[PDB]
Amino acid sequence: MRWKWIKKRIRRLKRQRKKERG
Amino acid sequence: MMRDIGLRVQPPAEKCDDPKCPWHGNLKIHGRVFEGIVVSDKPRKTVTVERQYYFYLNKYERYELRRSKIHAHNPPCINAKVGDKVLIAETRPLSKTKHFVVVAVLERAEERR
Amino acid sequence: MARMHARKRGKSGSKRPPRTAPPIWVEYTVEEIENLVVKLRKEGYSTAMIGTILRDQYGIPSVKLFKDPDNPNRNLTITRILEKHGLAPEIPEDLMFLIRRAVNLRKHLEQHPKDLHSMRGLQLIESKIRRLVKYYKRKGKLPKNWRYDPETAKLLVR
Amino acid sequence: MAIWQGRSLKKPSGGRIVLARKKRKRELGREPSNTRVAEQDKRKIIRTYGGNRKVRLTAAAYANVFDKSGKGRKVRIIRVIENPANRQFARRNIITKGAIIETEIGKAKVTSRPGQDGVVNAILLEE
Amino acid sequence: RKGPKRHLKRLAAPTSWYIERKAYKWAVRPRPGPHNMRTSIPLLYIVRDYLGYAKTAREARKILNEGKFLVDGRVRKDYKFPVGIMDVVSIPETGEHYRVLPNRIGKLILHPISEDEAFIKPLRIRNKRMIKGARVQLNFHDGTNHIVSIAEKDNYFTSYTVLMKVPEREILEVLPFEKGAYVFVTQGKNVARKGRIVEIKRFPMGWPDVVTIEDEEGELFDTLKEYAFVVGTDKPKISLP
Amino acid sequence: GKKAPNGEFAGRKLKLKRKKFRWSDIRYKRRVLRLKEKSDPLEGAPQARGIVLEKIAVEAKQPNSGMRKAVRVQLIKNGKVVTAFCPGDGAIKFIDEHDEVIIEGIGGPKGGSMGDIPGIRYKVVKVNRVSLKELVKGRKEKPRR
Amino acid sequence: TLLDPLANALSHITNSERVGKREVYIKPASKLIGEVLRVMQKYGYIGEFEFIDDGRAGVYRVQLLGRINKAGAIKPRFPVKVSEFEKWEKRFLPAFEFGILIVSTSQGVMSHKEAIEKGIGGRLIAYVY
RNA sequence: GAGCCCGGGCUCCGUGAGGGGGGAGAAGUCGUAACAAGGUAACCGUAGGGGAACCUACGGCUCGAUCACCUCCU
RNA sequence: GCCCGAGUGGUGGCCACUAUUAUUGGGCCUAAAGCGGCCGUAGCCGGGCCCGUAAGUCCCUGGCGAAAUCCCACGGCUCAACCGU
RNA sequence: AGGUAGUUGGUGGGGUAACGGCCCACCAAGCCGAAGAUCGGUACGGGCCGUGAGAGCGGGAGCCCGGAGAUGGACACUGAGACAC
């Protein structure tokens, strides 16, 4: 679980933060 | 210049006050009286006295600390100093924020907080 | 009894004599006692150790009980015997020993700086000084114009 | 004309205070004036709201003097020299409650408000 | 509302007159006159409500134009007349006198006494001040002003007992208030007591200036020199007899 | 010390504590801001009239299936799209498209549609200023336009 | 440190009580406690005490009859009017009978019942019942 | 001395292609992740990698594993 | 058949229940929730013993917090609501 | 989370029914703030009101009391009084 979520949250964050940074 | 002020208090040792003192002119002593402590002397003939009182809270059954600054005009016959009680008269306005003049000073070398 | 300060460890239970007036099987005059004190402060010993040697040699457990009454304003004891003569350090020994030590630390750290623990007691001794300062100011052994710092610690010791 | 009060400036704590009313008639005010030195006297009577007519001097030609016994006169004056407030005023000869002026013999110090009372007399300055 | 308040409501009508409170939506409002508004009583009331002589105000007003009542030994006709306190009011068509006296309670009541006491009206004067022509004058807070006392004080500060010959508009028999004299208390929550003054010793700083008194009962009353009114050395009757 | 300062002059701490901790009641917070009043259209109101854009039927929830009668109505001043649950059996009948339909809530304003219905926050009372429970009974009044 | 030395007396005294020891020892000692035990004894709750004043401290050795149920200090030590007494009466005490809400007063120190008979009040200090 | 206007800046209301997630629907598909040592104990913070569940490294923790083997403790 | 009764019910809001906002009168090992640990500023809170003041604090008096509404009495309207004292 | 430039004070003066930076000339650099200022939201305020065993919580409706307004916004006369439903 919290492994999952942390990396899902991180990936969401990055990918989206990539989309914001871009 | 030097006349009895009443309240059961003696007037300053020296006198030469400007017309914004109740020993000259048309600004006169009247009314209620307080006591508080000098924060600062920095402005000219002008002195901050901040009072402490307690207030009650009905909900909690307890008290609180509140602190009301009051602006006080010091007469050039006597100089206010930090950290001593000063006695204030209720008079008509000097200015936007100055409604008070200092009447009788009890001075002190001691300081807490 | 205890206070585990910067520790978890209960403090020593060392306890005073419950004597309230002094032994008379022990015998000294107000004059003789005063000499003994002055001689020891002349050596370079300090008031705790002065009270220590008098205890171990001359058999007086605390000075207050023996001396007062001889001017019953208060108890007469070592440094109050000293001040009337002018042998008292204007800094209280409490505050002095403290600062004294402190300046020694700094020199170690000077040469050795990779020291957690040694760094961490610098922080633990200053902050006792600070306090000891703070209250004295208000009591009056040290003027209100003072404030504590590591250059104003290296000046008091020298 | 001048509005005020005077509750519409700022708080002594740097708050903005906003007016929560309009004008009140009683609490309006008029503009300052320039009372000139001249040979003629230009007066006007004006009715206050307390219901009392008060004189405004818009010019004057006589002040005149007082000692420390107090013997008044009505005689000629000449140029206003030294006004406390602003030296600009001392060029255009604006009389004030504390103005200083040249009289016939001695300088004299104005000691009355000619913008509500309608009077000009003075007391001699001694060197 | 930024003009003058020229109406009064019943609910806004003070209960120191003992008015009826919900009779209508509007009460009779005193005009200015002799004495204070929430210390007075309207002529209308004494007629319509107090003494029943009226049903409608068309009655009362007629009654006051013809002359069933004189106030202060003098005729009236304004049917909005504040009748003063410690006051002389006369019925001339029957020969009645009432004092406008406060009760213990604090409502205004009329207390009936004979015609003889209706020539005298104790004044303690509200102030005393110099005027031009080198005179002083005697004040009151029912307004009534007198001139003459033969230069300077000759008597007391203001705590006076005056004898006013009320039909005659004249002042007679002046008498101070002293430390064994009588006082009737007209203002304060100690009203309707008449007593013997213990002393006039005071703590004057600011507004309060203290006077004590102990009555026949012995109830210690602290009133202002002003709330204190000098009934004299005892002449008119006590309220609640 | 079980939490709180107790001491004469401390009270202020008390006084701010409560308030700080009050805002953990969703309901309280929400009202004191007015989120109840801003979000779930109405502008707060008891009820709202609106024009029946169309009639739609939706499915029931998890253990359930049955065709609930729902309208789509547009509130008129609110100007917001509301899908809505209609009381009664036959009903969907008595409601013509483009009659006025007054609308209310149903079963706590919280958001809670009743157990069966997913969405529906709201209720219908009326068809052309005469209600639905009056139109389930034949006698009482019958509809127009 | 300590504060409320009284309270740390009282609280022992009660937890002392609840066990059913014979007598107590309270290492810190005082007027407050001294006085309070005095008033306590006066009502009778306790037997006899001796304090020995050591150059260190007063200590109270207290004799326990068995009477006391519960006796505790007040936390902020509230001021209480003589009108508000009845409220503070119903709350803290177990019923109308007992009446040692020990307050501190203008007259000295008293219980609740000894306070009421005089007629005077103030800030609360402790309780006993 | 108002309203009024003009040029710019900042903010807010009605409304818009497109875009994010939630509580769901539980008849399609992939896998077996966890819950039994779940069939490689599990979790944990950090880092990389994989379609997914997730795997691995390093450090921690037992809310840890089943006998066995060894060691202590009323 | 039960309730209530010219009412009864629906939606919405507020308060109670909710010691689910803890003053009265809540918790926080594992249920939500202890900061990874320390320092000391502001704050709150403070061992004993004597003396001054009496600021808080209590007691008494006195000025005062409009009417209305509330509570109690008596009186009025057939009764009460409502009003008057 | 820092705000403040008639801005805080001083001297002298104007204007006003009148004190006052109300306004203004000159001089000074204060004034306010973590005992929460400033800014933003929301809101007439009070008597009361609802509820609750109490403590408390919510509320400003008739009515009374005080203030503000009169299509938005400014402006004077006339009158004791208006910047005038």
PDB file of C-alpha atoms in Angstrom, chain D residues 1-125:
ATOM      1  CA  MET D   1     -15.043  75.965   1.818  1.00  0.00           C
ATOM      2  CA  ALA D   2     -13.748  73.001   3.920  1.00  0.00           C
ATOM      3  CA  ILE D   3     -15.649  69.788   4.734  1.00  0.00           C
ATOM      4  CA  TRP D   4     -14.262  67.937   7.842  1.00  0.00           C
ATOM      5  CA  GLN D   5     -14.533  66.370  10.406  1.00  0.00           C
ATOM      6  CA  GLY D   6     -12.172  64.657  10.732  1.00  0.00           C
ATOM      7  CA  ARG D   7     -13.289  61.172  11.343  1.00  0.00           C
ATOM      8  CA  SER D   8     -12.372  60.622   7.564  1.00  0.00           C
ATOM      9  CA  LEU D   9      -8.623  60.505   7.600  1.00  0.00           C
ATOM     10  CA  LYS D  10      -6.739  57.601   9.082  1.00  0.00           C
ATOM     11  CA  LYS D  11      -6.645  55.931  12.429  1.00  0.00           C
ATOM     12  CA  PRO D  12      -3.704  56.695  14.717  1.00  0.00           C
ATOM     13  CA  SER D  13      -2.836  53.095  14.034  1.00  0.00           C
ATOM     14  CA  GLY D  14      -2.591  53.376  10.249  1.00  0.00           C
ATOM     15  CA  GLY D  15      -6.065  52.082   9.587  1.00  0.00           C
ATOM     16  CA  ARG D  16      -8.076  53.766   6.943  1.00  0.00           C
ATOM     17  CA  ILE D  17     -11.232  55.156   8.459  1.00  0.00           C
ATOM     18  CA  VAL D  18     -14.077  55.649   5.999  1.00  0.00           C
ATOM     19  CA  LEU D  19     -16.843  58.178   6.360  1.00  0.00           C
ATOM     20  CA  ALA D  20     -20.110  56.557   7.324  1.00  0.00           C
ATOM     21  CA  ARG D  21     -22.333  59.535   6.949  1.00  0.00           C
ATOM     22  CA  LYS D  22     -22.300  62.682   4.910  1.00  0.00           C
ATOM     23  CA  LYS D  23     -21.603  66.279   5.726  1.00  0.00           C
ATOM     24  CA  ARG D  24     -23.379  67.826   8.731  1.00  0.00           C
ATOM     25  CA  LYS D  25     -24.114  71.505   8.148  1.00  0.00           C
ATOM     26  CA  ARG D  26     -22.937  72.524  11.609  1.00  0.00           C
ATOM     27  CA  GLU D  27     -19.649  70.851  10.953  1.00  0.00           C
ATOM     28  CA  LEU D  28     -18.645  72.664   7.766  1.00  0.00           C
ATOM     29  CA  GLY D  29     -15.951  75.400   7.666  1.00  0.00           C
ATOM     30  CA  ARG D  30     -14.777  78.484   5.691  1.00  0.00           C
ATOM     31  CA  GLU D  31     -11.459  79.234   4.009  1.00  0.00           C
ATOM     32  CA  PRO D  32      -8.612  81.373   5.356  1.00  0.00           C
ATOM     33  CA  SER D  33      -8.302  85.009   4.540  1.00  0.00           C
ATOM     34  CA  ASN D  34      -5.797  87.703   3.588  1.00  0.00           C
ATOM     35  CA  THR D  35      -6.385  90.858   5.742  1.00  0.00           C
ATOM     36  CA  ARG D  36      -4.384  93.563   3.832  1.00  0.00           C
ATOM     37  CA  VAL D  37      -2.561  96.645   5.033  1.00  0.00           C
ATOM     38  CA  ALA D  38      -4.266  99.605   3.334  1.00  0.00           C
ATOM     39  CA  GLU D  39      -5.588 103.154   3.920  1.00  0.00           C
ATOM     40  CA  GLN D  40      -9.192 101.958   3.702  1.00  0.00           C
ATOM     41  CA  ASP D  41     -11.179  99.468   5.758  1.00  0.00           C
ATOM     42  CA  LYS D  42     -13.078  96.702   4.018  1.00  0.00           C
ATOM     43  CA  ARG D  43     -15.373  94.904   6.381  1.00  0.00           C
ATOM     44  CA  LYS D  44     -18.213  92.501   6.043  1.00  0.00           C
ATOM     45  CA  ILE D  45     -20.692  91.114   8.557  1.00  0.00           C
ATOM     46  CA  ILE D  46     -21.433  87.362   8.369  1.00  0.00           C
ATOM     47  CA  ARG D  47     -24.041  85.307  10.191  1.00  0.00           C
ATOM     48  CA  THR D  48     -22.947  82.255  12.065  1.00  0.00           C
ATOM     49  CA  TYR D  49     -25.086  79.175  12.624  1.00  0.00           C
ATOM     50  CA  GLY D  50     -25.139  79.762  16.387  1.00  0.00           C
ATOM     51  CA  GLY D  51     -27.177  82.720  15.097  1.00  0.00           C
ATOM     52  CA  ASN D  52     -24.748  85.499  15.796  1.00  0.00           C
ATOM     53  CA  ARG D  53     -23.253  87.915  13.334  1.00  0.00           C
ATOM     54  CA  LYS D  54     -19.530  88.099  13.403  1.00  0.00           C
ATOM     55  CA  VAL D  55     -17.351  90.454  11.486  1.00  0.00           C
ATOM     56  CA  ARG D  56     -14.735  89.372   8.988  1.00  0.00           C
ATOM     57  CA  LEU D  57     -12.043  91.919   8.147  1.00  0.00           C
ATOM     58  CA  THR D  58     -10.993  91.753   4.535  1.00  0.00           C
ATOM     59  CA  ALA D  59      -8.979  94.885   5.062  1.00  0.00           C
ATOM     60  CA  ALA D  60      -7.990  97.318   7.827  1.00  0.00           C
ATOM     61  CA  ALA D  61      -6.120 100.673   8.229  1.00  0.00           C
ATOM     62  CA  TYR D  62      -5.672 101.293  11.973  1.00  0.00           C
ATOM     63  CA  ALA D  63      -4.580  99.126  14.859  1.00  0.00           C
ATOM     64  CA  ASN D  64      -3.029 100.984  17.597  1.00  0.00           C
ATOM     65  CA  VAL D  65      -1.224 100.726  20.448  1.00  0.00           C
ATOM     66  CA  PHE D  66      -0.837  99.670  24.095  1.00  0.00           C
ATOM     67  CA  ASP D  67       1.947 100.123  26.728  1.00  0.00           C
ATOM     68  CA  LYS D  68       1.855  98.507  30.179  1.00  0.00           C
ATOM     69  CA  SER D  69      -0.639 101.200  31.346  1.00  0.00           C
ATOM     70  CA  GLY D  70      -2.834 100.568  28.239  1.00  0.00           C
ATOM     71  CA  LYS D  71      -3.505 103.838  26.391  1.00  0.00           C
ATOM     72  CA  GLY D  72      -5.145 102.918  23.102  1.00  0.00           C
ATOM     73  CA  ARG D  73      -4.982 104.759  19.836  1.00  0.00           C
ATOM     74  CA  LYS D  74      -6.379 104.659  16.345  1.00  0.00           C
ATOM     75  CA  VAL D  75      -3.662 105.914  13.979  1.00  0.00           C
ATOM     76  CA  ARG D  76      -1.809 104.864  10.831  1.00  0.00           C
ATOM     77  CA  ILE D  77       0.165 101.641  10.443  1.00  0.00           C
ATOM     78  CA  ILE D  78       2.748 100.699   7.805  1.00  0.00           C
ATOM     79  CA  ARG D  79       4.094  97.386   6.391  1.00  0.00           C
ATOM     80  CA  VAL D  80       3.773  94.041   8.204  1.00  0.00           C
ATOM     81  CA  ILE D  81       7.246  92.935   9.112  1.00  0.00           C
ATOM     82  CA  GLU D  82       7.693  89.485  10.629  1.00  0.00           C
ATOM     83  CA  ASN D  83       4.799  87.053  10.661  1.00  0.00           C
ATOM     84  CA  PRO D  84       5.472  83.908  12.682  1.00  0.00           C
ATOM     85  CA  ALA D  85       3.696  81.336  10.379  1.00  0.00           C
ATOM     86  CA  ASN D  86       5.304  81.787   6.926  1.00  0.00           C
ATOM     87  CA  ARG D  87       7.427  84.637   5.537  1.00  0.00           C
ATOM     88  CA  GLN D  88       5.341  84.498   2.345  1.00  0.00           C
ATOM     89  CA  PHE D  89       2.549  85.876   4.482  1.00  0.00           C
ATOM     90  CA  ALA D  90       4.852  88.750   5.563  1.00  0.00           C
ATOM     91  CA  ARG D  91       5.063  89.902   1.943  1.00  0.00           C
ATOM     92  CA  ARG D  92       1.339  90.103   1.167  1.00  0.00           C
ATOM     93  CA  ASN D  93       0.512  91.731   4.598  1.00  0.00           C
ATOM     94  CA  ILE D  94      -1.780  89.178   6.186  1.00  0.00           C
ATOM     95  CA  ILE D  95      -2.730  90.230   9.710  1.00  0.00           C
ATOM     96  CA  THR D  96      -2.779  87.391  12.299  1.00  0.00           C
ATOM     97  CA  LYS D  97      -3.417  86.860  16.053  1.00  0.00           C
ATOM     98  CA  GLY D  98       0.356  86.796  16.513  1.00  0.00           C
ATOM     99  CA  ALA D  99       1.537  89.126  13.662  1.00  0.00           C
ATOM    100  CA  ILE D 100       4.264  91.801  14.009  1.00  0.00           C
ATOM    101  CA  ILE D 101       3.956  95.171  12.344  1.00  0.00           C
ATOM    102  CA  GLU D 102       5.452  98.607  12.057  1.00  0.00           C
ATOM    103  CA  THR D 103       3.370 101.332  13.641  1.00  0.00           C
ATOM    104  CA  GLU D 104       3.789 105.128  14.065  1.00  0.00           C
ATOM    105  CA  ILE D 105       6.674 104.937  16.707  1.00  0.00           C
ATOM    106  CA  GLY D 106       7.886 101.451  17.820  1.00  0.00           C
ATOM    107  CA  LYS D 107       7.103  98.012  16.502  1.00  0.00           C
ATOM    108  CA  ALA D 108       3.913  96.434  17.791  1.00  0.00           C
ATOM    109  CA  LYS D 109       2.626  92.849  18.213  1.00  0.00           C
ATOM    110  CA  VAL D 110      -0.854  91.886  17.095  1.00  0.00           C
ATOM    111  CA  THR D 111      -2.870  90.213  19.788  1.00  0.00           C
ATOM    112  CA  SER D 112      -6.412  89.535  18.350  1.00  0.00           C
ATOM    113  CA  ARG D 113      -8.279  87.382  15.764  1.00  0.00           C
ATOM    114  CA  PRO D 114      -9.684  89.682  13.056  1.00  0.00           C
ATOM    115  CA  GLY D 115     -11.368  86.785  11.198  1.00  0.00           C
ATOM    116  CA  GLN D 116     -14.055  86.070  13.834  1.00  0.00           C
ATOM    117  CA  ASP D 117     -14.002  89.274  15.979  1.00  0.00           C
ATOM    118  CA  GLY D 118     -13.240  92.196  13.628  1.00  0.00           C
ATOM    119  CA  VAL D 119     -10.653  94.019  15.707  1.00  0.00           C
ATOM    120  CA  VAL D 120      -7.073  95.151  15.243  1.00  0.00           C
ATOM    121  CA  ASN D 121      -5.037  96.572  18.167  1.00  0.00           C
ATOM    122  CA  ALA D 122      -1.490  95.998  19.408  1.00  0.00           C
ATOM    123  CA  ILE D 123       1.022  96.334  22.330  1.00  0.00           C
ATOM    124  CA  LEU D 124       4.540  97.829  21.968  1.00  0.00           C
ATOM    125  CA  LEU D 125       7.694  95.754  21.691  1.00  0.00           C
TER     126      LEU D 125
END
